[PDB]
Amino acid sequence: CFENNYYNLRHPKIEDLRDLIALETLCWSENLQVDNEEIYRRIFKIPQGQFILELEDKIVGAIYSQRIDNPQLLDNKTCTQVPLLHTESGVVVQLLAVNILPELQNQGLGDRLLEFMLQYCAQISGVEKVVAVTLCRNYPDYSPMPMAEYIHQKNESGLLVDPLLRFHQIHGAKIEKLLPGYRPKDWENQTCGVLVSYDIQHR
Numbered sequence: 564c565f566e567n568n569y570y571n572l573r574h575p576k577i578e579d580l581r582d583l584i585a586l587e588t589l590c591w592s593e594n595l596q597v598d599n600e601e602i603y604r605r606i607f608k609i610p611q612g613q614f615i616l617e618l619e620d621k622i623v624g625a626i627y628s629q630r631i632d633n634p635q636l637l638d639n640k641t642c643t644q645v646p647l648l649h650t651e652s653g654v655v656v657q658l659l660a661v662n663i664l665p666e667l668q669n670q671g672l673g674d675r676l677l678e679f680m681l682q683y684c685a686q687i688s689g690v691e692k693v694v695a696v697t698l699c700r701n702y703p704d705y706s707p708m709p710m711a712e713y714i715h716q717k718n719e720s721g722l723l724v725d726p727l728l729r730f731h732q733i734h735g736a737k738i739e740k741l742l743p744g745y746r747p748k749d750w751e752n753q754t755c756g757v758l759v760s761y762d763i764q765h766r
């Protein structure tokens with residue numbers, strides 16, 4: 564059936580801190596969670612570049628971003644370094660994370676949330692480009708196939724075999740390259756992140 568659920572989308576406020584930390588725990592393994600302070604930075608320093616999804620009173624989803632000068636600055640950086648790259652006047656929007664409560668996944672929420680973010684970023688003055696550093700979910704199934712080949716592996720159909728990459732693909736993302744050592748604690752992906760970009764010139 565068609566859900567018919569009352570969803571609200573707004574910028575975070577400081578009061579949302581505890582609920583957003585809770586949301587991080589439920590969506591990601593301990594190795595992939597960002598720490599309490601990074602959540603705080605995002606909602607304190609840059610409320611404009613974040614969105615909270617609420618169902619009733621409850622926070623059920625979040626999408627995070629910051630502004631950087633260019634995607635080259637991401638070469639040879641770990642994820643705990645990226646917060647340092649933020650500049651107020653950065654021409655590139657780096658989407659940092661998308662969080663959907665596991666019980667509410669596979670209902671079109673990720674989709675709707677990302678599309679809104681993309682259109683929201685298009686309308687921000689000065690912004691030329693949107694990039695995200697993602698990761699694979701199913702690589703252990705293809706190991707030891709080289710990841711550089713895995714991230715371009717398409718199915719039938721011509722959509723990417725990895726469901727986390729497909730998610731970006733079907734919203735117009737270009738898979739750019741691998742970012743080795745981006746996530747030190749992510750052994751399933753051999754620490755590698757995946758850089759994707761969005762052409763926003765049409766929106």
Ligand SMILES: CC(=O)SCCNC(=O)CCNC(=O)[C@H](O)C(C)(C)COP(=O)(O)OP(=O)(O)OC[C@H]1O[C@@H](n2cnc3c(N)ncnc32)[C@H](O)[C@@H]1OP(=O)(O)O
Nearest residue numbers: 658659660661663668669670671672673674695697727730
């Ligand atoms: C900003 C950044 O992206 S950087 C952060 C680092 N990580 C990332 O890059 C993002 C990682 N997260 C993801 O990509 C995940 O897919 C998530 C967390 C967004 C999943 O969120 P969801 O709300 O489940 O996404 P959504 O429901 O739109 O899509 C998931 C699948 O369900 C399908 N779906 C959509 N609506 C429905 C529905 N009503 N019923 C059943 N299935 C559905 C989609 O087609 C998709 O199918 P596929 O896996 O076969 O392609």
